[PDB]
Amino acid sequence: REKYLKSVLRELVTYLLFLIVLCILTYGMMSSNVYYYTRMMSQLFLDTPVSKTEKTNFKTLSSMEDFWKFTEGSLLDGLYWKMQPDNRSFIFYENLLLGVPRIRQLRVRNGSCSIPQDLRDEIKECYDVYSVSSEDRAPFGPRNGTAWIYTSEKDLNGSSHWGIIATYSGAGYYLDLSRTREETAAQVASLKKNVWLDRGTRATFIDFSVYNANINLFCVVRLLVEFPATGGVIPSWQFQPLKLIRYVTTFDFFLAACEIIFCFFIFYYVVEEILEIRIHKLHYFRSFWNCLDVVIVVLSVVAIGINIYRTSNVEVLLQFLEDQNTFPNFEHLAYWQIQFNNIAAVTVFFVWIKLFKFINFNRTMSQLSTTMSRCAKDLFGFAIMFFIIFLAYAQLAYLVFGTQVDDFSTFQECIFTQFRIILGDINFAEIEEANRVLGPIYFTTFVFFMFFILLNMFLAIINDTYSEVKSDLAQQKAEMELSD
Amino acid sequence: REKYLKSVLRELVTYLLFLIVLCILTYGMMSSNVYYYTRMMSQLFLDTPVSKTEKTNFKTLSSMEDFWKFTEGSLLDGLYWKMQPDNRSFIFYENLLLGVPRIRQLRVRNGSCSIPQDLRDEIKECYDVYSVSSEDRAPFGPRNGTAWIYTSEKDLNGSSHWGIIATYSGAGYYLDLSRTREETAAQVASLKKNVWLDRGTRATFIDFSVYNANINLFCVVRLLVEFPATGGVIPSWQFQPLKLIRYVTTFDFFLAACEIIFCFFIFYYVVEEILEIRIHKLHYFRSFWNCLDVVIVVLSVVAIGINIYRTSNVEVLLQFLEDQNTFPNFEHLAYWQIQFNNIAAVTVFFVWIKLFKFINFNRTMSQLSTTMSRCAKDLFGFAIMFFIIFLAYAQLAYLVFGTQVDDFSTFQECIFTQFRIILGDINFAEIEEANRVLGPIYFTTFVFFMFFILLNMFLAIINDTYSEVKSDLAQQKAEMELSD
Amino acid sequence: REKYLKSVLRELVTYLLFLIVLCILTYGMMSSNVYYYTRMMSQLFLDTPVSKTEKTNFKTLSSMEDFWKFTEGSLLDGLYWKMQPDNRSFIFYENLLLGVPRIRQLRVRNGSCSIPQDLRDEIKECYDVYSVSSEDRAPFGPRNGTAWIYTSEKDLNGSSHWGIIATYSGAGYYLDLSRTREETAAQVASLKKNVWLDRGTRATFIDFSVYNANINLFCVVRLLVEFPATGGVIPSWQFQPLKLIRYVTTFDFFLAACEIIFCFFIFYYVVEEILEIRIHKLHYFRSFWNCLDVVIVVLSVVAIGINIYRTSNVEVLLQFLEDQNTFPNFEHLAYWQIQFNNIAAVTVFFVWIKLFKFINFNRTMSQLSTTMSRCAKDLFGFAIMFFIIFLAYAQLAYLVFGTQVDDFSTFQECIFTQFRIILGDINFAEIEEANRVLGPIYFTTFVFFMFFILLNMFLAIINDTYSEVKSDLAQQKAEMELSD
Amino acid sequence: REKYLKSVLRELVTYLLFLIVLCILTYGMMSSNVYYYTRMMSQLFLDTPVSKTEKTNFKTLSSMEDFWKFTEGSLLDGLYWKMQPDNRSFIFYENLLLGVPRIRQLRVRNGSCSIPQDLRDEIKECYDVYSVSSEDRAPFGPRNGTAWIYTSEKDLNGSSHWGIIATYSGAGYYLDLSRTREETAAQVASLKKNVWLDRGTRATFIDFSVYNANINLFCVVRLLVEFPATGGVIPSWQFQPLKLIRYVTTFDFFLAACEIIFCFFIFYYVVEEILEIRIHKLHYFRSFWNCLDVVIVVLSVVAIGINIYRTSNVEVLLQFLEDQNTFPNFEHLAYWQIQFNNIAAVTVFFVWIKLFKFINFNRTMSQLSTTMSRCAKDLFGFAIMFFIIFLAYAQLAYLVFGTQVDDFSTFQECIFTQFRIILGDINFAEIEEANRVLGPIYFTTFVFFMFFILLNMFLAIINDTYSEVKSDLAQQKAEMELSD
């Protein structure tokens, strides 16, 4: 009674404070305005029409001509607003354009992959899909300024980006845009005249950044426009907000204090876990609750490391921007900001589920946790079998529909599409348009096996295992009644 | 036999009459035309295009320029219709514009939140997000009439409104529009010329009201246009119909009689409940059916109170409107009308579920109610655990997606989005566009745990508890067969 | 062995032939082209734009002006096609316009419902919602021709139609359009000039018909445009195809022979059922399979009656059309054609489920039918309770959302919306826009009770009852093993 | 121990290698770019607007006039791109138009089906729906060139296509388009002038092909435009990519080696299966795992046969194209390419499920496979009953909605629509617009029976059968405990 209950109360109170501190960190990271901030930026660049007298937008850029219309018209009419009655430009009035934008481009060599000898009469040229081996180093067109000559990824301060069809590395050819509107449009017109953008060009980035004074919040923009070798064009985007500068109001000091307290909490857990390793040399790794604790500790250490080694020291970049009007390179920081934010979120998710360990001081909740534990083995056993059939079905679907329907375009997405089908969300009209024989057969059979038969085995396994724990508890009550 | 069955018959008949009276009140409150009435009003103002030669509408106002186009063109061309061949204006011919509209505006001070010293070269101004502390009291632009000078919430007859991004209180700056069309457009043009609407402006209300003679039904309009500090614009609306005047036809007298009868019914319940409190001093609060009765009684008292203290005496406002052509302020009444309508609905919902108490005079229905009662404890025990995992998942989702996807924009909505995911309704394409690594992982894992494992524990708990009551009833039949 | 098996074989073979004949009738009624026939007609009139230089269509007619644009432009440019190089008009070339269209209108009296005395200064007129009592009999505008004078429902050959907001009876004011295009447009222009269509007008029908020579198929059109008293406009439509003339090819003779055979089959069933009534005077109505048989017999008699008393003798109408160029009134026949088609379908549905009676000559299928029979009582017992909670929830939803969201506009639809919610199809964004406090609460609670708790009681009832039949069969095998 | 485990290890390792080889074949067949290739082609022809100054596209061609606008404008402006500064045309620059397109047409005779004698005054012509009997052989209009004279399916090198409303066989009338743009437009204008396309015309194909040099990938196009006799127009499409030429890079040699290895694997299986037939003469066909093996063997033989007899020898066609500028007829090869791809996919699906046979060397997975085996009989027994009710419901729905809603247009699709309804995806608004009485009743009843009652019997059958295997294993443990 003395050692158990006191040690549980010691552990619980400290864990609850650790949770509260963790929830204060999450509340500080995410301000509730932020959504609307990014939404307005997206509306400006993505959703708006390209020119005044047509339907098309950024989201559905089809041609190279279309992309050229976007860069000349609506890209600029987003970035450069006529000054309110120096000549520094704002967005929406409230947001500040930092320095200038940048148009970057990669390109692939002439004859980078060999053509079959059957069609050597007609075709005298070829360019294959992006890879670091096949990327062009040589000059291009007019030999004039930085815009046309290649520059390596260590020469620039740029990193690799994970694009849609393929990963695009570092940099090659790039123009820095002007701070004024009329000079920019002249530079873009000169690029269009001399055909800077052509067949062989693969990845094109339009990058820049903004800062909102009102809520103290930087934000970067990365308009990637992939050109697949196939022919047409694929777009994407990224709007990452970013609390770059920290210390301003009383709320920030309070957030800073919590982060320091979190550090001491993590330190205490690390001591407590590894003290227990000294006691139990090889008996410690098998218990579930301890394993979960170690994972929370490791994530927290990684979060701290990302915060200290990288995210803190970056103020050097911002100080360089303060003294000039050139391009400011945030892009490398944002990449770590997202990664930090990811890891913190997963930490929170695991921290909340750990709370279970101190729930079972009531009878009913205790029996349910014992049911869940005993069923785990059977469910895991079934889960393998379920996945085998699931992944075969996905492979079938990929082989049939891969060409036609967006849903199953890559194998990565095919799984997730099938998961949506189980719930109740599917683009059936498109499947049926792709293949009228097998398409609906795949769909019927999948529903018939997965939804009526196999998903109910999970249930049957749980069901019976619950009944067996209730009978076990009834016999414990009846056998105790017989003994007394 | 005598005391039980007679007292049940006494209670049942009186309860059934109380239910019928309650259903007559609900039928009287809601006329089946009402939907189409509000639909036509919404179509006029929300859905229509802003100007003649463009795509945009009210629902997707992006810029301040856009809002200005709406107020000058389609707002007025909704309100003011060319008289059919005094000069009083109608809507659709059948509806009557009451008096005039009102354009209200709030605004925040210059330099209400401090700027960081790193960017003190470029930025010389700032305005933070709405709060009562930071709201501007001082004058503005031309010092001319009521439109530009501040007025407090007790000086005006206006209340606080619960807006989208933040709660907007009382009033500040406001113009009353003209009764004719051509004077209004001149006043709106003069506002646009002198920049009455600028950076720093937060909440803007366009209010007015209409009355339909044909079905005797007033209706208010509240076009709120929020300006978040971020930069752009967010719209909303509210179309509340309102049976203001009552006594006209034989149907209204019948409705009035029912409301009076309902009053005596409630009075009788109150006596019956509190007479039972005198009998059972501390044994009464634990039984479910009695607790439900007390809650129905409290709601009914609150409904009566809202009807008498406020909703009835408001005819003073309507009488003031009858003698003039100025702005009529319905807005304060409507707020209570909705609250009444809410509470009445919840009363009805609880009243219907109370009917259960007099269902169990058949064997099968009795066993099911006994199953539901015994399972309640286990289900409640599980419900806590289910919610812990659910709310952790929501917290994870909020941390990942909060910036990108509309669905999880606020924590309040994040829960409800997850509930939709379980059923079969989700915007998957948007999640995947926000975060390709973790986004679909969150979705898979959530489906895997919640939909295949955890939701089936509810079922398993019910299932086994039903089987145990059936075995208990079989042994009661078999043990009675052995005794006889 | 002799009496049972022979009598089962006698019954089965005759029933299978009756089923095959019934499936031949259904195959004959529905030709697989028919869908595309109606689809093209709908595209022409509903989906197309009103004028050349605007967005709006028939489906979203908002104003009276809009309706006037439709009748003058796209209505006529659908009906009248420039003759291919008599002057008889076609649709798509392949379809034939029969005679002419008709524009019918109803109207309500001046001051049909009394106005409150508070607003007697401004409002000097009123018109209430459609009813037969309040419908106007008197003349109107210019006293000229049939178009402006009222005519009763027995004077015309027209019936009542079940409209959307209210049932519209017979007729009142109507113009028959011309056979040529240029005369029609002059008549429509003259109506628009003198304001034939005004405030007080309620229901407006644009009726006509077409005949396709190519597949031998008539089709009627009923463009109803309701004007609710509220102010705006509501549209609907109806495109009923119709095999009017029968005897042409060998397929029709074969269909006719099957219908005659079906008649003798029904006759034989009637004798067989009522012979069994003579045997078992009051022991016959309780068994399920016999009850189902009687219902199939009654429906078949009703189907035959509708076929003979009405649908056959109508050729008189078609013969009158053959001799002239006036309006042909199909409308009364179509009403019975749909009713016949409904009843036949329900007959087929019941006939197929009757097949169960001759399935149970295998052991496994027999046990399942015995499980389904024993569970019926409990499920029925639960079904009542389930519906009580369901209908309370619907009543709550109706009281909250009735004004705002289309989904719950009428109580009839509210039920069906809730059924969709359970499956996985809901317009959540609209509910949340209607009421942010209670709206999502209604949705959460409904999902929590209905989807996690109550729908699984059905399952639990079945589950346990199946297990009890399996134990009963195991003891029958074990007790038979002990006896032998 | 020696014979079992060694023979299992022999079988397992060889099967795993066979699986890996099979997965290498699938990875080789489907390149991850392919989706985007077909997507860009579809965007060009389907989604784009017809003319510059209107809304309509290919997907929603309504009229013959509309089709004529497509062929004259956007068809050509897709195919023919202005040469970059011989005169050979490209698509997107990166893709190559092969030779030329082809416009093919079928037509039906005058008076092919007899008209009723009641309407012999007005109608003097008729054309019925496509069939080989009724197809026109005779000449047409100007007797000039190949475009107007009929040619049979054995005279041409063309096959039958499975269209939407009806199967269209071989060929009749066809024009080969020019290699240049300006000659094509003159030929299309001459067709439009002399009314080559008229009433009576049924199927129209616009065929051509492209080749991408960059990724070595041919692709065919088949723009079918069906004219139903009803009146209007129905479109469809088909974009089949095709790896025609093989041997180029090291990856292809590796793929070729794997295909040869697969051949020897299949050969070994065939010997192993039929060696076992020699041993067990009539005891072999009843076991499940052997039956599955035979089916995988048969599919593989069919896949090999399709690869050798047809898909390999087709290079003759490509060699004929290399020497000329005429039409190249790929169409016959593509048909087999899809069929091969189908069969391979189904082979993969079955191969993956075969893996189960070597899973059961752990206790938990073994019990689940024994549960699944014993339940199979009951589930199969229930499945029949379930389908009877399901197919009756479908028949009911078809009879009601067949005319109105797209969903249930054909009986083939009606089944699949009902399957979607169970999951949570349904167009409810359309059903309700088709029939307000019975429409929602069908939907309620279907949900009530199928979703709450019948789908849970599957579950109940599994549930109890799992519990019975767990009790059987518990008694095997307890009886073994008693014996020891």
Ligand SMILES: *[C@@H]1O[C@H](CO)[C@@H](O)[C@H](O)[C@H]1NC(C)=O
């Ligand atoms: C591209 O490569 C081909 C084949 O090697 C060659 O004939 C041609 O001259 C090259 N063109 C350019 C512009 O480099």
Ligand SMILES: *[C@@H]1O[C@H](CO)[C@@H](O)[C@H](O)[C@H]1NC(C)=O
């Ligand atoms: C090269 O760049 C200069 C400016 O540095 C510009 O004036 C000139 O037009 C460019 N050369 C050519 C050939 O266009």
Ligand SMILES: *[C@@H]1O[C@H](CO)[C@@H](O)[C@H](O)[C@H]1NC(C)=O
């Ligand atoms: C706004 O505040 C800043 C900083 O205090 C000040 O320099 C400026 O004069 C103010 N402007 C106005 C218009 O009040």
Ligand SMILES: *[C@@H]1O[C@H](CO)[C@@H](O)[C@H](O)[C@H]1NC(C)=O
């Ligand atoms: C002030 O208001 C008056 C009308 O009361 C108006 O005539 C005048 O234009 C306004 N003053 C200025 C400076 O615009």
Ligand SMILES: *[C@@H]1O[C@H](CO)[C@@H](O)[C@H](O)[C@H]1NC(C)=O
């Ligand atoms: C309509 O009724 C009102 C009230 O009875 C009356 O004053 C008016 O003259 C009537 N007008 C017409 C056109 O009948």
Ligand SMILES: *[C@@H]1O[C@H](CO)[C@@H](O)[C@H](O)[C@H]1NC(C)=O
């Ligand atoms: C009455 O109808 C006649 C044709 O019958 C027409 O000429 C005349 O215009 C109509 N009367 C008036 C006043 O318009």
Ligand SMILES: *[C@@H]1O[C@H](CO)[C@@H](O)[C@H](O)[C@H]1NC(C)=O
């Ligand atoms: C079509 O057939 C009808 C009926 O046999 C005949 O009168 C007519 O001359 C035919 N027309 C043509 C163009 O063949």
Ligand SMILES: *[C@@H]1O[C@H](CO)[C@@H](O)[C@H](O)[C@H]1NC(C)=O
């Ligand atoms: C027949 O075809 C020739 C070309 O071969 C063309 O010149 C002529 O216009 C055509 N005949 C008629 C009558 O159009």
